[PDB]
Amino acid sequence: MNIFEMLRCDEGLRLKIYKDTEGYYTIGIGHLLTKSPSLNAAKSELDKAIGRNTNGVITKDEAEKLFNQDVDAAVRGILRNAKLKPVYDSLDAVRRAALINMVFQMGETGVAGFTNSLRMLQQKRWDEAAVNLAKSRWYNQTPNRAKRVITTFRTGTWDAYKNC
Numbered sequence: 001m002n003i004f005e006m007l008r009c010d011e012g013l014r015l016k017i018y019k020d021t022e023g024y025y026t027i028g029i030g031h032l033l034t035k036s037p038s039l040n041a042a043k044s045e046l047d048k049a050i051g052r053n054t055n056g057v058i059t060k061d062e063a064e065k066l067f068n069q070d071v072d073a074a075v076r077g078i079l080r081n082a083k084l085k086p087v088y089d090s091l092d093a094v095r096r097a098a099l100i101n102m103v104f105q106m107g108e109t110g111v112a113g114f115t116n117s118l119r120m121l122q123q124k125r126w127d128e129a130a131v132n133l134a135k136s137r138w139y140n141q142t143p144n145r146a147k148r149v150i151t152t153f154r155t156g157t158w159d160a161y162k163n164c
Contacts, residue, residue, distance in 0.1 A: 028063035
């Protein structure tokens, strides 16, 4: 298991524009297009991202390319973030994957706001961090995915990703 297989497991793969859990226009592997309510705005962002007239539908390769860019960007955002970087550097390889997962889902800003949780991860207080992470809108809105990520931080293994 690796970050790619992990995220592919959590987000799924859709070749036509869809609405995410929050009601936002998305395509491929969790690639947010726009928070705007206009499907037209969404098709426009899509065409711009892909470099061609897609008519709202993309191929597997196109989906994968967007996915590769998004993972890369998430990693680079963590490395450029003064709050995130030190945590990431302190973690083992599995747990790093967990943090990357959160950033991909909720953005750099969102994650950096988890002040107390970040501090506990840095101190390697796994059980305490797992409990604090769960006290969030994140966990309440997408509890199955959050539990999977939280278990990853708690155990430092890929057990939560067995049935993928």
